[PDB]
Design the sequence.
DNA sequence: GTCGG
DNA sequence: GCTGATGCGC
DNA sequence: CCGACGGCGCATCAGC
């Protein structure tokens, strides 16, 4: 992609606006509007000279064009400069960095004068379990995970899953599967021949084994098909500890596995494109369905490889590396 | 906020 | 007790 | 003008 020195001032401005819309205004559609605009501008291979120029791009409209004109004329946006100074809004925005504190919790905290991590720390009884864990690992959860460490993590997960039952299949998806040099977390998809579209404790026994070997250290949420938690690589006799990392584990039916793998591999942006580009078809995380004459989705087609799904749409098979 | 019925 | 709604992360 | 904009699983809240 183009160098960030091209339009980084504009992209950074739009992303900061997007965050205030999500976290303070609770205006999720304006957050996505600003993100879309920032993304289309990030990809534009020219230094923008005017709001009119940017307005030609899809997702940039009248108001972002006007903001780009103020930014180019002054190096700032009055509106952003003001909200950055605002103790209430800045504090709400900041607290949403804690995993489990969304815009609603953040506002409620700030309204009670709880505005900093220090205030959260003093008020543990006002936090739910997930929020306590997000606070405990605030710094670690914002660190990226080098690929080297992801491989070590993958080694542990695959070894322990097979130890519980050698018929499991486990696949690390997300940016790792796309060969990224670092990841934000570990996404694991799990299946087992006994669990299909029509069919005990298959997710639990895996989570329990990873806990028994002290890889999984905390649990954010855990149901029959989705686990969200925290893990940590072991360190040698005295290296400093590794950071705690986020890990998800999803149990998916065997006959929907490849649609699962495709979906959770991503990127989010690739999937949107692959879905939008689907001829008389609709693809979700579970299935690929042929749309009828009226646009109604019919029955799921059988799938025994990611490629089958590319075939159905006559889409040129991209490998995970090329789904960016 | 942007798009498009 | 329970159902359904909302918040949340992704 | 005005509605769509992603949808899922789990934790927790609101209310019967
Ligand atoms: N909000 C999201 N909704 C999605 O459907 N997705 C889908 C399902 S998961 C897949 C991309 O996965 P992630 O969200 O794990 O992001 P990633 O692994 O590509 O990136 P990162 O290394 O986790 O930062 O695309 C992603 C989202 F972030
Ligand atoms: Ca991920
Ligand atoms: Na609002
Ligand atoms: Na435009
Ligand atoms: Na948060
Ligand atoms: Na109810
Ligand atoms: Na993820």
Sequence:
């Amino acid at each position: 992609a183009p160098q960030e020195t091209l339009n980084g001032g504009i992209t950074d401005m739009l992303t900061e606006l997007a965050n205030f819309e999500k976290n303070v205004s609770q205006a999720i559609h304006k957050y996505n509007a600003y993100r879309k605009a920032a993304s289309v501008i990030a990809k534009y291979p020219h230094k923008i000279k005017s709001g009119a120029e940017a307005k030609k791009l899809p997702g940039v409209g009248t108001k972002i064009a006007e903001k780009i004109d103020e930014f180019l004329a002054t190096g700032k946006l009055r509106k952003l400069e003001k909200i950055r100074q605002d103790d209430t809004s800045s504090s709400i925005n900041f607290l949403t960095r804690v995993s489990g504190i969304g815009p609603s919790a953040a506002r409620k905290f700030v309204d009670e004068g709880i505005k900093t991590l220090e205030d959260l720390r003093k008020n543990e009884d006002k936090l739910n379990h997930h929020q306590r864990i997000g606070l405990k690992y605030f710094g670690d959860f914002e660190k990226r995970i080098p690929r080297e460490e992801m491989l070590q993590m993958q080694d542990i997960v695959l070894n322990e899953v097979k130890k519980v039952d050698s018929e499991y299949i486990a696949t690390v998806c997300g940016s790792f599967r796309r060969g990224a040099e670092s990841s934000g977390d570990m996404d694991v998809l799990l299946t087992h021949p006994s669990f299909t579209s029509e069919s005990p404790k298959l997710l639990h026994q895996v989570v329990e084994q990873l806990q028994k070997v002290h890889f999984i250290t905390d649990t954010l949420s855990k149901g029959e098909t989705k686990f969200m938690g925290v893990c940590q690589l072991p360190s040698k006799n005295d290296e400093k500890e590794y950071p705690h990392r986020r890990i998800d584990i999803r149990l998916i039916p065997k006959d929907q596995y490849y649609c699962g793998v495709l979906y959770f591999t991503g990127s989010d942006i690739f999937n949107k494109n692959m879905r939008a580009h689907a001829k008389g078809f609709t693809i979700n995380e579970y299935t690929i369905r042929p749309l009828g004459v009226t646009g109604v989705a019919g029955e799921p087609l059988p799938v025994d490889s990611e490629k089958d799904i590319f075939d159905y749409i006559q889409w040129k098979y991209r490998e995970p590396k090329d789904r960016s």
